[PDB]
From a paper:
To better understand the role of the ClbP TMD in enzymatic function, we determined the crystal structure of full-length ClbP embedded in a lipid mesophase. Seeking structures in the presence of substrate analogs, we initially focused on the catalytically inactive S95A variant. Early S95A crystals yielded electron density maps that clearly showed the position of individual transmembrane helices, although their resolution was insufficient to assign the registry or helix connectivity pattern. To overcome this challenge, we mutated non-conserved TMD positions to methionine—L454M and I478M—and used anomalous diffraction data from selenomethionine-substituted crystals to locate these sequence markers in electron density maps. We obtained two high-resolution structures of S95A-L454M-I478M: selenomethionine-substituted ClbP and methionine-containing ClbP bound to a product analog. The resulting high-quality maps allowed us to fully model the TMD helices and unambiguously assign their registry. The two structures are nearly identical (root mean squared deviation (RMSD) = 0.15 Å over the Cα carbons of residues 38–414 and 431–491), except for the extent to which the TMD’s intracellular loops are modeled; we base our analysis below on the higher-resolution product-bound structure. We initially crystallized S95A-L454M-I478M in a precipitant solution supplemented with compound 1 and obtained a 2.7-Å structure that suggested that monoolein, the crystallization lipid, was bound at the active site. In our model, the headgroup of monoolein forms polar interactions with active site residues S188 and H257. The chemical similarity to myristoyl-d-asparagine suggests that monoolein acts as a substrate mimic.
Colibactin, a DNA cross-linking agent produced by gut bacteria, is implicated in colorectal cancer. Its biosynthesis uses a prodrug resistance mechanism: a non-toxic precursor assembled in the cytoplasm is activated after export to the periplasm. Although the transmembrane domain is required for colibactin activation, its role in catalysis is unclear.
Numbering used by the authors:
A (entry chain A), B (entry chain A): 35 to 414, 430 to 495
């Protein structure tokens, strides 16, 4: 009775999938009760394990709507106030502004008005077994007064995870399960505790030399509330369906939802962007309301978009980081709205991969110019010690160069988020520097 | 009775003015009937002529709201249809898509859904005495099907200027005066016919080597409807006031206004931008409605913003191109809304000026290394002919390099829009290339 799914929808999704080169991609579209599912590709490439509805994905920053709804549930029960100071729950977290400890509220983390620098993502995403969030951020220097500006920082929702635990006295996992996944019936959603083996989880990939490459990304327990809630497409359908049909929902959960979609208007807006952030969702009233959020991980990415007044919900899930997946929801919504859609935008990882492939061939053409000029002059101890300084000196500068241009970012961070080809640039430079040393020393020796 | 103007408003405006380094800046703010005026600096620097309320500015792209309201007036009278094909009025303008002539409507130019490439701005802004717009754009190749995408192109409103003339049988100047400036009472607003002398017009400036520099910019008659309507602050106050109080207005002008603020929803929207374009205005419903448009000329810039439901109107006018002036209206509106505002954004011209100043000193440090190494070896006909090839060859490549990287842009365009320092880079390269030739030829001569 429901009829066939839309064939022009399938073309768009396929095309975006082939452009992005993600191995697996799952998409689901609700329009007033009728869903359309699009499940393509492979969750694991080497074993050829198929993308099925049981495949489990990391939700990326779409984790934050879970964390924030829980903050709203605890507020609705009266175990928390939006305006509570964070020090009441995280007594050891001193965060500074202009040298003085600052007053940061719970709202300041909900709405990314905290001033936490971008580098806090490097700190919170590296595993630290016996280390609490408050110690990891202790004595960070904020970028502005709290509440003065919107500035997205993923670590803002790891502070909130830690507040949930102090308030309930329970682990994040238990609070998520007991307050959200059990009562909504999302029987395959979970907040993980680390990288214990999750059956059905897709393998994650990252672009490198033009092909997807298997990448085992870190999964730090303290970072779960901002990045690493795991789920499946049927479950995200139930999640969508809940936000759209809050009638048969208990009154606490319904009220917490209503307050979870209340954007923070007390910030400056740009000339081209008056969109508001709520409790882990962007709120846009233009051709709206249009509630969306994207997920971006080192080896996963995803998006979600809701248009409540027309009962539309879009979610897409993929086991690779691609801007074409962060935009796919806007594409699908353009199609559902006016029957047309833009050409795929670019992708930052893919452009960077190409840049390195060129640079690496450039560094290889240079090695040939040195060795072709070398077998020319060749066919016609203190040397070995001096020539190891040129590569070892460039390799030393390359080592500390990240920490100087951007204080707080290290090579670990670069490797985690960049193309797999990113290591060829230093080593190619190291190899080119070693050979260039031997040439200009053996040319004075003639 | 009205009270003092707001002192925190004055600080913000002063500060933005000193950051941007514009010589003169005029700002006016309406909030339910009470205006606040801020008139600072100098309209002409060499003669020290003061910025007064009589100072006349080029409105930049804020010209388009004038052109488009006239299109709406002619539509309301029934002398034009939104959906009319452009060829009915510009019979010689053939514009191609995929090799075939395309059907472009009047709406396609109103809402920047035409496919006109960015380079059409270079063509329409260079003076051409006996040359009509339709001949200047004849056989351009569009970037996409008409109506398929929003893509801003200033030449879209020069096509509309030409439609107004064919329909009325009158010049653009006469139609603007008779339909808008006379009936609204804006007795100092005019659409110019070229660079005849306009008493009271401010001098225009462009950044160069860190200081503002007097710049005589082109003013091509065919480009007036998109860039070069001239006006004053009292007159822009009357303009604002008209859009906000359409009651005592004749019914044709009131209806044309209502249709002039109707955004075009039939385009794809980005994930972070669902704002619509209307008849020369951006329409944003977020914290709105917020109707705005900025003006950007080579040596002027300006902005306007209206919030009709709260009777707010902001306009700013300056005799230099600065992003800090394109954003000033958003700043003022943030202040009027929540009493706070962001730090000034960057400026593309100023960053580019600094980049060149560094490059030019780099090219000068290189000349010293060559001449210091030269007076060293010096104190211890076929040469003059060979050494003029290195600079003349680099000067040839520099000449055609713009037309190769971006087809349709020439050095004329670069000089018009870039920092005054932009010429030092080629000539410094030319001088460095000539000296480098003499060094490696007189070093083989030893
Ligand atoms: C130079 C590196 C710049 C950006 C890489 C980081 C871009 C993505 C930053 C995280 C975006 C996000 O949504 O957070 C999810 C979570 O933090 C994921 O670990
Ligand atoms: C490389 C040059 C890129 C941009 C320079 C042009 C940026 C501004 C283009 C015009 C913006 C506008 O609003 O149009 C007004 C009028 O066209 C003004 O001549
Ligand atoms: Cl509990
Ligand atoms: Cl445990
Ligand atoms: Cl935003
Ligand atoms: Cl007439
Ligand atoms: Cl004339
Ligand atoms: Cl837009």
């Amino acid at each position: 009775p429901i009829g066939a799914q839309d064939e022009r929808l399938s073309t768009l999704i396929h095309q975006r999938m082939q452009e992005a080169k993600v191995p697996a991609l799952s998409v689901s579209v609700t329009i007033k009760g009728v869903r359309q599912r699009f499940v393509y590709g492979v969750a694991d490439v080497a074993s050829q394990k198929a993308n099925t509805l049981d495949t489990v994905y990391e939700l990326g920053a779409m984790s934050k709507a879970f964390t924030g709804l829980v903050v709203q549930i605890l507020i609705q029960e009266g175990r928390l106030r939006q305006g509570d100071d964070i020090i009441t729950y995280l007594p050891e977290m001193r965060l500074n502004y202009q040298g003085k400890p600052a007053s940061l509220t719970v709202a300041d983390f909900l709405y990314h008005t905290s001033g936490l620098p971008f580098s806090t993502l490097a700190r919170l995403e590296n595993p630290m077994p016996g280390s609490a969030v408050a110690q990891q951020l202790r004595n960070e220097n904020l970028l502005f007064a709290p509440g003065a500006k919107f500035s997205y920082a993923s670590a803002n929702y790891d502070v909130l995870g830690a507040v949930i635990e102090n308030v309930t006295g329970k682990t994040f996992t238990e609070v998520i399960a007991e307050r959200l996944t059990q009562p909504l019936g999302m029987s395959a959603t979970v907040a993980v505790k680390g990288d214990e083996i999750i059956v059905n989880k897709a393998s994650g990939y990252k672009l490198g030399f033009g092909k997807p490459v298997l990448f085992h990304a870190p999964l730090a327990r303290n970072h779960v509330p901002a990045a690493y809630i795991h789920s499946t497409l049927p479950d995200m359908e139930i999640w969508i369906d809940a936000w759209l049909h809050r009638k048969a929902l208990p009154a606490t959960l319904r009220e917490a939802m209503s307050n979870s979609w209340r954007g923070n208007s007390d910030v400056p807006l740009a000339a081209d962007n008056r969109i508001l952030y709520a409790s882990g969702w962007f709120i846009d009233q233009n051709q709206g309301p249009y509630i969306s959020h994207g997920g971006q991980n080192p080896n996963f990415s995803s998006c979600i978009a809701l248009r409540p007044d027309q009962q539309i919900g879009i979610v897409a899930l993929a086991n690779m980081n691609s801007n074409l997946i962060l935009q796919l929801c806007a594409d699908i919504d353009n199609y559902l709205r006016i029957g047309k859609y833009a050409d795929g935008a670019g992708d930052a990882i893919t452009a960077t991969d190409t840049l390195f492939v060129y640079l690496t061939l450039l560094l290889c053409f240079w090695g040939a110019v040195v060795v072709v000029r070398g077998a020319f002059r060749v066919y016609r101890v203190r040397d070995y010690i001096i020539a190891l300084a040129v590569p070892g000196l460039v390799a030393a500068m390359l080592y500390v160069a990240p920490g100087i241009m951007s204080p707080g970012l290290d090579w670990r961070f670069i490797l985690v988020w960049g193309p797999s080809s990113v290591l060829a640039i230093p080593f190619g430079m190291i190899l080119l520097a070693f050979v260039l040393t031997l040439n200009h020393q053996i040319k004075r020796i003639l």
